[PDB]
Amino acid sequence: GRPEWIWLALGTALMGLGTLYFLVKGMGVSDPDAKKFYAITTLVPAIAFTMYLSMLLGYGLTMVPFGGEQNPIYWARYADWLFTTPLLLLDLALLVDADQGTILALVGADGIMIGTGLVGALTKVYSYRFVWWAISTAAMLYILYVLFFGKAESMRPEVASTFKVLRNVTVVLWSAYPVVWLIGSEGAGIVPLNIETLLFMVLDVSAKVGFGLILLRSRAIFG
Amino acid sequence: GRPEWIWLALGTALMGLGTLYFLVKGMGVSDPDAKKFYAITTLVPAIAFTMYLSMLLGYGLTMVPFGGEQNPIYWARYADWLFTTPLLLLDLALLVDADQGTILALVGADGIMIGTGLVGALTKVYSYRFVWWAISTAAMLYILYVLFFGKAESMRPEVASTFKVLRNVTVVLWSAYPVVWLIGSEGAGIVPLNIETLLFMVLDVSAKVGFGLILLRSRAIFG
Amino acid sequence: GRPEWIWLALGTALMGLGTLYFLVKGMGVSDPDAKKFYAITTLVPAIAFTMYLSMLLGYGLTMVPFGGEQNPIYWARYADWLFTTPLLLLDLALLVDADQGTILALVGADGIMIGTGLVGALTKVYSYRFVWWAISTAAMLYILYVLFFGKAESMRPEVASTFKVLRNVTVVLWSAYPVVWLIGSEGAGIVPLNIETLLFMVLDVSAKVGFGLILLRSRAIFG
Numbered sequence: 001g002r003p004e005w006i007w008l009a010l011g012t013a014l015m016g017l018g019t020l021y022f023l024v025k026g027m028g029v030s031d032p033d034a035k036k037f038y039a040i041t042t043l044v045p046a047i048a049f050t051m052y053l054s055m056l057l058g059y060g061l062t063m064v065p066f067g068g069e070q071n072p073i074y075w076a077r078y079a080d081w082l083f084t085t086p087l088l089l090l091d092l093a094l095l096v097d098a099d100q101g102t103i104l105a106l107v108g109a110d111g112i113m114i115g116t117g118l119v120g121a122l123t124k125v126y127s128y129r130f131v132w133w134a135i136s137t138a139a140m141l142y143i144l145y146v147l148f149f150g151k152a153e154s155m156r157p158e159v160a161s162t163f164k165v166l167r168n169v170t171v172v173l174w175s176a177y178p179v180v181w182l183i184g185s186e187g188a189g190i191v192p193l194n195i196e197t198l199l200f201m202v203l204d205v206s207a208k209v210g211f212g213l214i215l216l217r218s219r220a221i222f223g
Numbered sequence: 224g225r226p227e228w229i230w231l232a233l234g235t236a237l238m239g240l241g242t243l244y245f246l247v248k249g250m251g252v253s254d255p256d257a258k259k260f261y262a263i264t265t266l267v268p269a270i271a272f273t274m275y276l277s278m279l280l281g282y283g284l285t286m287v288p289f290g291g292e293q294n295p296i297y298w299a300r301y302a303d304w305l306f307t308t309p310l311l312l313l314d315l316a317l318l319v320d321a322d323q324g325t326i327l328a329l330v331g332a333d334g335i336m337i338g339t340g341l342v343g344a345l346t347k348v349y350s351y352r353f354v355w356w357a358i359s360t361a362a363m364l365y366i367l368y369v370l371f372f373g374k375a376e377s378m379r380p381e382v383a384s385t386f387k388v389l390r391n392v393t394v395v396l397w398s399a400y401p402v403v404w405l406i407g408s409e410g411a412g413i414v415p416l417n418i419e420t421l422l423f424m425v426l427d428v429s430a431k432v433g434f435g436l437i438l439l440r441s442r443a444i445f446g
Numbered sequence: 447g448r449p450e451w452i453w454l455a456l457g458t459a460l461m462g463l464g465t466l467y468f469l470v471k472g473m474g475v476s477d478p479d480a481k482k483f484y485a486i487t488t489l490v491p492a493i494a495f496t497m498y499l500s501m502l503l504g505y506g507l508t509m510v511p512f513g514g515e516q517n518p519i520y521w522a523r524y525a526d527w528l529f530t531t532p533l534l535l536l537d538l539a540l541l542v543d544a545d546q547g548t549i550l551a552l553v554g555a556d557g558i559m560i561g562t563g564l565v566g567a568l569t570k571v572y573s574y575r576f577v578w579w580a581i582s583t584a585a586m587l588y589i590l591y592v593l594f595f596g597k598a599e600s601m602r603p604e605v606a607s608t609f610k611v612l613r614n615v616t617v618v619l620w621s622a623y624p625v626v627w628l629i630g631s632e633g634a635g636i637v638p639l640n641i642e643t644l645l646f647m648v649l650d651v652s653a654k655v656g657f658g659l660i661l662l663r664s665r666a667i668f669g
């Protein structure tokens with residue numbers, strides 16, 4: 001039906017397999033700290049799996065009028081990210097034993113990032129969609145700022161090493177989302193929805209399963 | 224108007240009385256641990272009370288097209304369960320001093336269970352509704368698994384005793400929900416909505432007020 | 447377009463400036479406890495900023511049929527309060543080192559207060575709107591009760607002093623909301639929407655930025 005269906009189907013399959021792999025791999029783990037990381041990390045692709053399935057079956061898709069056309073908007077992505085992005089930030093924060101204040105700042109700014117992105121995606125006045133994109137981007141920039149300038153002296157080498165790798169992976173991949181949104185169907189519409197869907201699938205799988213494989217294979221998750 | 228109104232009214236009344244009873248019973252409690260259990264346990268029927276009232280007044284009801292008919296779907300149940308089921312799991316987890324990793328696993332899987340159940344309840348393609356039911360059921364099975372195989376050596380007798388009772392009550396009652404959903408109006412439609420509503424009221428009151436009476440009368444909630 | 451636009455624009459500007467001020471003021475803070483208070487306190491007007499902008503642009507506004515008319519209902523307020531009121535209660539609770547049980551009681555009752563207020567705001571049967579208002583008010587009264595009768599012996603003077611001031615500010619300002627709602631467009635409609643919007647803007651800015659200035663200038667936030 002929809003040309004982007006193949007990418008949604010592949011996304012569903014990859015998130016599903018990733019979830020199952022992490023689920024199996026986490027069996028037997030008794031270390032409290034490691035359990036936290038496995039729980040957070042397995043839940044991420046499990047949620048993504050449900051939302052990709054939602055998009056594939058057509059439930060997480062809605063039509064938004066703007067620019068004089070009926071624009072297909074997959075709102076299920078925000079329902080996904082609303083829960084998965086904060087969880088991913090939690091993995092990074094727990095890894096460096098961040099204090100509660102910083103965790104709340106990250107989670108709250110993340111909520112603002114996704115919430116304003118959702119508002120922008122459903123906004124009927126074309127020009128306003130970009131106002132929301134700008135605010136969401138400012139929130140993302142705040143998050144990236146905190147990750148880099150927001151624990152070193154008393155920090156295990158493996159912890160510092162894995163955190164630096166996951167932080168770099170996060171900054172690169174997350175930074176692409178606003179660009180894809182801006183040039184894709186939710187924004188300027190210069191890149192067709194099918195290609196946009198492919199881009200998000202690669203980014204999502206990398207930021208979730210890729211990110212997860214790196215974290216769960218590290219000894220940093222253990223006390 | 225709607226034949227199932229009597230069960231919604233009785234459900235509203237029972238949840239309301241249960242809330243008031245727990246509220247009174249919890250007065251004077253100074254023990255920190257006991258306070259946690261009273262807060263969690265009183266909030267559960269208070270939320271259920273609001274959603275049952277929502278259904279009674281008709282606000283938590285919507286019409287979903289599928290199978291060639293306008294099907295009355297009480298979505299308010301998921302708004303209820305989304306918050307009450309995780310809270311109930313929290314009572315069980317705190318009772319056994321479960322570690323954060325396991326708590327997150329339970330809460331996250333519970334969210335998936337209710338979220339996919341909601342998607343299934345509102346899905347317009349009949350066959351797909353059952354795909355969502357299957358995923359939600361898999362999440363429930365994971366939860367039941369964790370409760371039984373997911374703390375013994377260093378565990379007070381009263382704690383182990385009450386937990387085992389509440390765990391058995393939980394497995395039996397919770398396991399009935401997917402069956403009721405499957406044979407009821409949201410699924411195969413072989414059992415009429417009025418009878419389905421009665422079933423859920425008995426299950427809800429038992430899983431909330433019944434469950435609550437057992438827990439709050441035990442000495443396990445005290446340090 | 448809408449006469450109340452000026453108050454929404456001023457609200458947007460004030461919440462935005464307040465957010466920026468708190469953001470700057472919180473720079474350099476290394477004290478863990480102080481960080482918690484700055485995070486919570488800065489997030490509050492940041493969220494309010496987004497919802498006021500939502501109302502200004504028209505996204506957070508919907509039409510609800512009741513009383514034989516199309517009533518303009520700004521639902522964005524509840525999306526705001528759902529997150530900001532619990533955060534404000536968290537500031538007060540952390541300030542007095544409240545135990546988890548009491549925190550959950552406050553947060554849960556707050557959720558009920560806002561959730562039932564939202565249901566009332568969107569209810570099509572006029573008389574029922576007031577039933578929801580009554581339940582929401584009962585939840586607010588419970589919260590006010592807990593704040594006054596729910597830690598003294600072992601409590602720093604500055605902490606007790608600032609808490610008492612913020613508690614008084616909270617009881618006075620919060621108590622006004624149900625009155626405004628009752629006499630405003632969501633209720634009896636005796637006070638026009640434009641005036642109602644002005645009232646909420648003054649209350650919101652005072653309960654958020656005013657409240658925030660008092661808290662963040664106190665030494666109580668430091669360990």
Ligand SMILES: *C/C=C(C)/C=C/C=C(C)/C=C/C1=C(C)CCCC1(C)C
Nearest residue numbers: 117133136137140174177178181207
């Ligand atoms: C599993 C998914 C991940 C890690 C998704 C990350 C999403 C973002 C960083 C999204 C950010 C956006 C903006 C900064 C601007 C507005 C549009 C968004 C929501 C695509």
Ligand SMILES: *C/C=C(C)/C=C/C=C(C)/C=C/C1=C(C)CCCC1(C)C
Nearest residue numbers: 340356359360363397400401404430
């Ligand atoms: C107070 C209510 C309780 C304890 C409700 C429990 C609800 C469930 C365990 C629901 C589970 C469902 C499935 C496993 C399959 C799909 C349909 C549901 C949501 C009814």
Ligand SMILES: *C/C=C(C)/C=C/C=C(C)/C=C/C1=C(C)CCCC1(C)C
Nearest residue numbers: 563579582583586620623624627653
């Ligand atoms: C930043 C906003 C604040 C501090 C808002 C406070 C909101 C309330 C205390 C609202 C309470 C209401 C009731 C008690 C009755 C029903 C209507 C409401 C939601 C306006």
